[PDB]
Paper text:
RIG-I and MDA5 possess tandem N-terminal caspase activation and recruitment domains (CARDs), a central DECH-box helicase domain (Fairman-Williams et al., 2010), and a C-terminal domain (CTD). To gain further insight into the role of LGP2 in the anti-viral response and its co-operative role in MDA5 signaling, we performed structural, biochemical, and cell-based studies on chicken (ch) LGP2 and MDA5.
To further characterize RNA binding to chLGP2, we determined structures with the 5′ppp form the same 10-mer dsRNA (i.e., the cognate RIG-I ligand) and a 5′ppp hairpin dsRNA with 3′ GG overhang at 2.2 Å (chLGP2-10ppp) and 2.0 Å (chLGP2-3′ovg) resolution, respectively. In the chLGP2-10ppp structure, the 5′ end has a unique conformation (corresponding to one of the chLGP2-10p conformations), with the 5′ppp being accommodated without structural changes. The α- and β-phosphates interact with His406, Ser407, and Asn408 from the Hel2-loop, and the β- and γ-phosphates interact with Lys634. The affinities of LGP2 to various dsRNA ligands were determined by fluorescence anisotropy. chLGP2 binds to a blunt-end 12-mer dsRNA with an affinity independent of whether the 5′ is a hydroxyl or a tri-phosphate, consistent with the lack of significant additional interactions to the tri-phosphate (and its variable conformation) observed in the crystal structures. In addition, while hRIG-I’s affinity to 5′ppp dsRNA depends on which nucleotide is also bound, being highest for ADP:AlF4 (Kd ∼ 1 nM) and 20 times weaker with ADP or no nucleotide, the affinity of chLGP2 for dsRNA is independent of bound nucleotide. The only fully “closed” RIG-I structure in which all motifs are correctly positioned for ATP hydrolysis, is that of the isolated dRIG-I helicase domain bound to dsRNA and ADP:AlF4 (Kowalinski et al., 2011). The closed conformation of the chLGP2-dsRNA-ADP:AlF4 complexes reported here thus closely resembles the latter dRIG-I structure.
Numbering used by the authors: 1 to 313, 317 to 673
Write the structure that this text describes.
RNA sequence: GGUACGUACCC
RNA sequence: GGUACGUACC
């Protein structure tokens, strides 16, 4: 497994100490090239230290086990992710290592830490390797780390680390002209403090006939001729809107636009406390989710989302709605049972799998879907489909750690189990989210299907690339004449523009490039400063005593701004000793997969008057504190009443929690 | 469960 | 300015 010519060529500038981006195709071997750069870096000085940053939990282990472990003949290499996190302080672990591999946010947390044992500076490393470095833009973690690097650089700081970015796809950043695309490439160079974009110019022929391209096919599907299940949902949505007695109610049932309008209505009804309107809007949204699920997967998947909503449950509005569902329930379930009205997305997916998993399972595939819920539903569909039950498909779901009431996440270990069985064919088919669109290496994977996705060209290129095998195939499975098909074709062209843009940046005169980089780095550090000042202005508009929180459901006042403190600059706790008379504990003890350094979860908490979900208890060392979720309240200030979805935009200051001070004050009372 | 960011969409 | 989803951290 000695380095290919093009790998040695792409790291020549890195070996000379220059900051670079290594631009090589998906599956070309950027990781092994980085390892070689790390070895020579560490051999060439004493006391060097490398950090290797990734953007998914699963890439930490993959990169350690498949590539970086070889450095252990001479050097100390440690991996840190979230799951393991809580045992060691990161500062101690890094400083005791020659190479640390971690998700970027782990490093960022250490860079911001107040504790001496956890804290790190950028100057504690001599080389940073940034995997999938195209994410180093905007306010992503990668770019927060690098903007601090730029601030320091521009302020004269010395011995900042060398930067080695790795990517197959810098992208065009939404730009469709050559001018724009070039401007985007230079911004990424500026963000990463890049001196050279290194590629395989002199080994372009070896790289062509070695790293194979999958052959590409459009597997287009038609709209259902007859959708009586959908038609019936739409009738009910109209009946509910009639009952609401409101003009200018939107009519485009079964779309993301309708979903936006109806949630925006629900926000307004919460803000003005129109209880009737808010309740109807909440139900209508649920009918709209069912239509969307219906278009994506099975009728019965859509039916079950709706039925679980009405089964969990008085006042006259809710009673109208319960009755309306009950009137239609049996008919909806019977329609969902009928094979005549099958989703042609699914018929089309069946053909593909039928053709490519015969002989029974020589193929090795990933079907990409947008949502975790869709991936689970597709697995169920596979298992209850006879046309495939006969061939031997051992399938599983792969998701990241994202989580909601619609679908839970998968931990590091649970992801790893699926990946390991897929690698050598114990599993031969994954239903996956974008968790696995980049970086994942399965040499034998020979089939990628992208199931009705709407993404940028980076995600298209990257997901294709998971098919590492010779003779791979890539399928676009989408609706004919859709926006999704249009975007796919546009993205193909945007990949070409991206290439043209990079080559133009690569051939620029050195003086003209350096001045442009300088100009862009300056504007970045100034733009950030201005943005920070503007965020702080907003944060100090109101005294915390003049802000009141109301329950989003019943509008009762529950606490003031001055009752709130932050734990780890994230979790908003109410420290008022009488807040306990306003909330009720509504569950038994909640258990997470991950465990944290200073706290564990207690029970869910609800509004004592209406039972609306508010948040959860945190058992922080020796005390129990209620954590509030901003989405479950209307915030009332002197100027307005506003339902917030984030805490960063609130108009009053919130201090950090002090465990010490809190104990003193609570222990004085009884 | 909490927090943040990214992508897509609408304005 | 919002809506949805995803991932990462806790
Ligand atoms: N010089 C080499 N010889 C043989 N195999 C290699 C070489 N370099 C990389 N590989 C293998 O090629 C595959 C793709 O590498 P990877 O680092 O995942 O690609 P990417 O460039 O997309 O990060 C891996 O399985 C890796 O072990
Ligand atoms: F470009 Al890669 F894994 F880094 F496909
Ligand atoms: Mg949540
Ligand atoms: Mg890679
Ligand atoms: Zn309430």
């Amino acid at each position: 497994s000695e380095l290919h010519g093009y790998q040695l060529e792409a790291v020549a500038p890195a070996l000379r100490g220059r900051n670079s981006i290594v631009w090589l195709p998906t599956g070309a071997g950027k990781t092994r090239a980085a390892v070689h750069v790390c070895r020579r870096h560490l051999e060439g000085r004493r006391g060097g230290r490398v950090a290797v940053l990734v953007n998914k939990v699963h890439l930490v282990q993959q990169h350690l086990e498949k590539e970086f472990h070889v450095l252990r003949d001479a050097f100390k290499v440690t991996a840190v992710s979230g799951d393991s996190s809580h045992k060691c302080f990161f500062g101690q672990l890094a400083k005791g290592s020659d190479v640390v591999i971690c998700t970027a946010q782990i490093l960022q947390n250490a860079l911001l830490s107040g504790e001496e044992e956890a804290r790190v500076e950028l100057t504690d490393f001599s080389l940073l390797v940034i995997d999938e470095c195209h994410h180093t833009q905007k306010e992503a973690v990668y770019n927060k780390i690098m903007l601090s690097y730029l601030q320091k650089k521009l302020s004269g700081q010395r011995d900042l680390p060398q930067i080695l970015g790795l990517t197959a796809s810098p992208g065009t950043g939404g730009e469709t002209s050559f001018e724009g695309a070039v401007e985007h490439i230079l911004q990424i160079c500026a963000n990463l403090d890049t001196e050279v974009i290194a590629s395989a110019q002199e080994h372009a022929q070896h790289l062509q006939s070695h790293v194979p391209q999958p052959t590409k096919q459009y597997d287009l599907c038609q709209e259902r001729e007859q959708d009586p299940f959908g038609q019936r949902l739409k009738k009910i949505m109209a009946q509910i809107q009639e009952h609401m007695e409101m003009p200018e109610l939107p009519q485009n049932f079964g779309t993301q636009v309708y979903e936006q309008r109806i949630v925006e209505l629900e926000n307004r009804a919460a803000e003005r406390f129109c209880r009737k309107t808010r309740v109807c809007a909440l139900h209508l949204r649920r009918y709209n989710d069912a239509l969307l699920i219906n278009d994506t997967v099975r009728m019965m998947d859509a039916f079950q989302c709706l039925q679980q909503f009405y089964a969990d449950k008085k006042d006259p509005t809710e009673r109208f709605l319960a009755t309306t569902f009950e009137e239609n329930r049996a008919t909806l379930q019977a329609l969902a049972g009928d094979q005549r009205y099958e989703n042609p997305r699914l018929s089309k997916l069946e053909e593909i799998l039928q053709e490519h998993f015969q002989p029974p399972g020589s193929s090795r595939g990933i079907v990409f879907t947008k949502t975790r819920q869709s991936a689970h539903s597709l697995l169920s569909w596979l298992q209850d489909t006879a046309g495939l039950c006969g061939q031997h498909i051992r399938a599983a779901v792969l998701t990241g750690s994202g989580h909601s009431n619609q679908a839970k996440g998968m931990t590091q270990n649970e992801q790893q189990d699926v990946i390991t069985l897929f690698r050598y064919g114990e599993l031969n088919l994954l239903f996956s989210t974008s968790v696995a669109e980049e970086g994942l290496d399965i040499p034998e994977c020979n089939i990628v299907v992208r199931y009705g996705l709407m993404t940028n060209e980076i995600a298209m290129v990257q997901a294709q690339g998971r098919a590492r095998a010779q003779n791979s195939m890539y399928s676009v499975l989408a609706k004919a004449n859709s926006r999704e098909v249009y975007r796919e074709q546009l993205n193909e062209s945007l990949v070409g523009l991206m290439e043209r843009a990079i080559r133009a940046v690569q051939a620029m005169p050195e003086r003209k490039y350096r001045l442009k980089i300088v100009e862009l780095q300056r504007n970045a550090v100034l733009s950030w400063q201005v943005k920070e000042a503007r965020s702080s202005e907003r944060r100090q508009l109101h005294d915390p005593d003049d802000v009141y929180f109301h329950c989003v459901n019943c509008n009762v006042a529950v606490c003031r701004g001055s009752d709130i403190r932050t734990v780890e600059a994230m979790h908003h706790v109410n420290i008022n000793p009488n807040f306990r008379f306003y909330y009720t504990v509504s569950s038994g003890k909640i258990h997470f997969e991950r465990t944290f350094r200073d706290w564990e979860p207690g029970c869910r908490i609800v509004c004592s008057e209406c039972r609306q979900e508010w948040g959860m208890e945190m058992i922080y060392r020796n005390v129990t504190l209620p954590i509030l979720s901003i989405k479950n309240f209307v915030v009332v200030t002197p100027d307005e009443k506003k339902k917030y979805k984030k805490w960063s935009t609130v108009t009053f200051p919130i201090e950090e929690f002090s465990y010490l001070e809190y104990c003193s004050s609570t222990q004085d009372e009884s």
